[PDB]
Amino acid sequence: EYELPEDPRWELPRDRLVLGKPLGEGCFGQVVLAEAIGLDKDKPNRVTKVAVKMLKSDATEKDLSDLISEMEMMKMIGKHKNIINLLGACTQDGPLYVIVEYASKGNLREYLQARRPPNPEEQLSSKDLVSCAYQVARGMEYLASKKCIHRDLAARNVLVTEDNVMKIADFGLARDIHHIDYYKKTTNGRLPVKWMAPEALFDRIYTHQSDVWSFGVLLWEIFTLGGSPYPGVPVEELFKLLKEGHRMDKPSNCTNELYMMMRDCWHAVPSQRPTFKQLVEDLDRIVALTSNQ
Ligand SMILES: */C=C/C(=O)Nc1ccc(CCN2C(=O)N(c3cc(OC)cc(OC)c3)Cc3cnc(Nc4ccccc4NC(=O)C=C)nc32)cc1
């Protein structure tokens, strides 16, 4: 069924997309790099590198509605500098193509890891790392204001552009039924359950406050330069640690102020955690006062 309603403000003719090859290492080949010709109505002789999400070969009738929902969700949420933005779509005369912004330097976890000290790439200053935190906070603040709750806020779901702009991804998905499946690992072999707030983990309660918990874990990821939370800790033992009120240790190069921020994000009482608005304001002040040397 490739008869879909057309929204002309977002529509791009298929012969304006030059489809490249799958992004990342290449497992999720449903999303590919591509070149859009004349994406903007102003001078259509300009090419723009973009990312294109399409349906797999064995697409179910609901995987279709899944992608469509994600697309409509992004339309409603609107645009921000620090999220992966919708750019257009191909809905008529062929398979559904959803066109979004492209991130050349990969996810934040990869980005950070590839810039650790020992052909090096780059070394991030202290101001750089706090700046990363600020950008993600600013993105999450916008998403929160649009009543959007992220399902898995983590470094893996933050993407980095050519200009080193942090962009939040996968914020337009739906709460998968119930069965979250706590033992399922990511492609890098980590347990996403270690980013989950306790109330979301034990009572299945998801609020903006649970995202702040996740941002805390993300902050820890940033200042450990892509470090893995709770190495060697299975799901069962994580639960025990959480019930006992255990918290991750302070990263080595991390200032006490920033570690306090993490701990505040990890408050046992959800109402006592800071808001993303607070976090943006604080991180703004810290960047200004953080050394570039
Ligand atoms: C086993 C495969 C593996 O290693 N993982 C893997 C993870 C993600 C991706 C593509 C990620 N991606 C993406 O999904 N984008 C996107 C698309 C939609 O469609 C609605 C919505 C989004 O948010 C709501 C986000 C856009 C996008 C843009 N740029 C990248 N680039 C990238 C990410 C991670 C690693 C490497 C790259 N770039 C390259 O590979 C370029 C050389 N990714 C996405 C693929 C694999």
Contact (Cβ atoms closer than 8 angstroms) between residue 90 and residue 14: yes
Q: Which residues are catalytic?
A: 152
Q: Solving technique for this entry?
A: X-ray
Rounded to whole angstroms, the Cα distance separating 52 from 110 reads 21
Burial class (CB in 10 A: 0-12, 13-18, 19+), 137: buried
Contact (Cβ atoms closer than 8 angstroms) between residue 109 and residue 203: no
CA 160 / ligand 1 centre spacing (Å) = 10
Atom 19 of ligand 1, residue of closest alpha carbon:
53
For residue 269, what are the contacts with CB-CB under 8 A and spacing of at least 6? none
Q: How far apart are the first and last CA of the chain?
A: 58
Q: Give the nearest ligand 1 atom to 84 CA.
A: 23
* Radius of gyration of the chain from its Cα atoms, rounded to whole angstroms: 20
Name the amino acid, one letter, at 233. V
Identify the sign of the CA torsion 35, 39, 40, 44.
positive
Burial class (CB in 10 A: 0-12, 13-18, 19+), 240: exposed
CA 101 / ligand 1 centre spacing (Å) = 10
Contact (Cβ atoms closer than 8 angstroms) between residue 171 and residue 143: yes
Burial class (CB in 10 A: 0-12, 13-18, 19+), 20: middle
What residues does CATH 1.10.510.10 cover in the chain? 106-289
CATH of 1-100, one of 3.40.640.10, 3.30.200.20, 1.10.8.60, 3.50.50.60: 3.30.200.20
- Tokens representing residue 211 in the block: 């995202």
CA 116 to the chain's CA centroid: 21
C-beta atoms surrounding 190 within 10 Å: 17
Question: Any bridge partners for residue 143, and if so which?
Answer: none
Rounded to whole angstroms, the Cα distance separating 109 from 101 reads 19
Contact (Cβ atoms closer than 8 angstroms) between residue 68 and residue 96: yes
The DSSP element (H or E) to which 31 belongs, if any, is strand 31-37
Burial class (CB in 10 A: 0-12, 13-18, 19+), 172: buried
In short, whether 108's Cβ falls inside 6 Å of ligand 1 is no
Least Cα distance to 153 among 230, 206, 81, 223 occurs for 206
C-beta atoms surrounding 288 within 10 Å: 10
Burial class (CB in 10 A: 0-12, 13-18, 19+), 224: buried
Burial class (CB in 10 A: 0-12, 13-18, 19+), 180: middle
Q: Coil, strand, or helix at residue 26?
A: coil
Rounded to whole angstroms, the Cα distance separating 141 from 81 reads 12
Identify the sign of the CA torsion 167, 97, 171, 247.
negative
Contact (Cβ atoms closer than 8 angstroms) between residue 287 and residue 279: no
User: Gaps after which residues in the chain, C–N over 2.5 Å?
Assistant: 118
CA 205 to the chain's CA centroid: 20
Rounded to whole angstroms, the Cα distance separating 180 from 233 reads 19
CATH number given to 106-289? 1.10.510.10
What residues does CATH 3.30.200.20 cover in the chain? 1-100
Rounded to whole angstroms, the Cα distance separating 109 from 102 reads 17
In short, whether 189's Cβ falls inside 6 Å of ligand 1 is no
Q: In what order do the strands lie in the sheet with 86-90?
A: 17-22, 31-37, 47-53, 97-101, 86-90
Contact (Cβ atoms closer than 8 angstroms) between residue 123 and residue 44: no
Resolution (in Å) of the shown entry? Answer: 2.4
Q: Coil, strand, or helix at residue 136?
A: helix
Rounded to whole angstroms, the Cα distance separating 142 from 224 reads 26
- Tokens representing residue 63 in the block: 């995987």
Tracing tokens 């179910």 back to the chain, one arrives at 60
Identify the sign of the CA torsion 157, 281, 175, 227.
positive
Rounded to whole angstroms, the Cα distance separating 183 from 192 reads 9
In short, whether 77's Cβ falls inside 6 Å of ligand 1 is no
Identify the sign of the CA torsion 33, 38, 39, 42.
positive
**CA torsion, ordered 137, 142, 146, 150, to nearest 10 deg:** -30
Rounded to whole angstroms, the Cα distance separating 116 from 225 reads 7
For residue 7, what are the contacts with CB-CB under 8 A and spacing of at least 6? 75, 89, 91
Specify the DSSP class assigned to residue 274.
Answer: P
- Tokens representing residue 279 in the block: 């976090």
Q: Give the nearest ligand 1 atom to 188 CA.
A: 4
C-beta atoms surrounding 29 within 10 Å: 13
